[PDB]
Design a protein around this nucleic acid. Sequence first.
RNA 1: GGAUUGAAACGCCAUGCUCAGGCUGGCGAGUGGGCGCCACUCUCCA
Lengths: 117, 117, 141
Amino acid sequence: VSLDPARTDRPYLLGRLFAVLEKAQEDAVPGANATIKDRYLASASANPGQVFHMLLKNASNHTAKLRKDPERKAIHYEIMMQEIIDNISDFPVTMSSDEQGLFMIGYYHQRKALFTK
Amino acid sequence: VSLDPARTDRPYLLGRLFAVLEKAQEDAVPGANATIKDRYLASASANPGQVFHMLLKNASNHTAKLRKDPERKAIHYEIMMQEIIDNISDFPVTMSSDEQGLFMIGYYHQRKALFTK
Amino acid sequence: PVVPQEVSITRMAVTTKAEAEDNRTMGRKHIVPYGLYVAHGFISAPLAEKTGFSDEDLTLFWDALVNMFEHDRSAARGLMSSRKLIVFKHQNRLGNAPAHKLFDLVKVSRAEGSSGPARSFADYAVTVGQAPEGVEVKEML
RNA sequence: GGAUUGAAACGCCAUGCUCAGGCUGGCGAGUGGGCGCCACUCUCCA
């Protein structure tokens, strides 16, 4: 039992997306006291459409920044975003509690994978 | 300890998760009134699918609280959380009276293991 | 299903001779964000004949049911109120239908705008069917 | 095709665990703390 690239359930996809935004941010800005996780974990799971919209602004800004320097990862992450955001039809305003459980699994699963290598 | 780290039985896993959560919380906040057990034991058993996702919020907050300090155990717990959850495909809705018993077992074995030096 | 919650409290002062010597004490509260409840009841005439329970008492009972909560406010109680009341009246001293059939005429379900967690009465829809010939349904109470 | 101190041999009919009772009254997570000091996109060809 591990990460399934084919689950195609919306709250699972949202969890994966969250996890990889965390990872990309990490590489963006070293040395931060607090991660986006610590800041937004709860909110994200309660109000998808609310926040998700917001975060992508900053992510855009960052990837804009990061092309100057020769270093890359971040093109793999931009592709990973672009896959998950194409599979997600739309952003729910809110999720049933039981669904907020499944969101945690997609996050953890995805994280572990990225934890490797 | 009698703990079997390769059982992979869902209720057993759940119980281990519970125990680890409890330990984390305990470490976070010395001098607390009571334990997680005391507050949420019943509910967890009753409805695993509704409570675990709330527990994991607080877990994060505790970890955050901890890690900033030289007592960076709390990184070690998070890795276990990763490992445990990894094996789980989804949360149950309901549990039989039988797996409830199993659930307990897992809890206890893990508890003793943590308390080992 | 319901999900109970718990919260924490400070305190100015100390009750007892706590000489150990800020926020001096903890405390707890237990709450329910939201929930909707149902109940059933019966009345029997043969037993009433044995005690004299009469009509005026029945009217007073209806009134008590309608206005029960209004005088109950307390710290812990929160906000509570009654919403609906339906009464079935058979046409003879012994009913004309089984009870379980009658209770089945009332049905409760989610409104169209389900939207995940329920937080108001508005989230629900209530409907009542039509009773057999021998039973009289009055719901406007 | 006389005879195992034997050959035959019911424990049986039937009986409410019952009437009823609030987990209640109420309590601040709060006083305040600089992300700072300084750094060339620069040296060629109608």
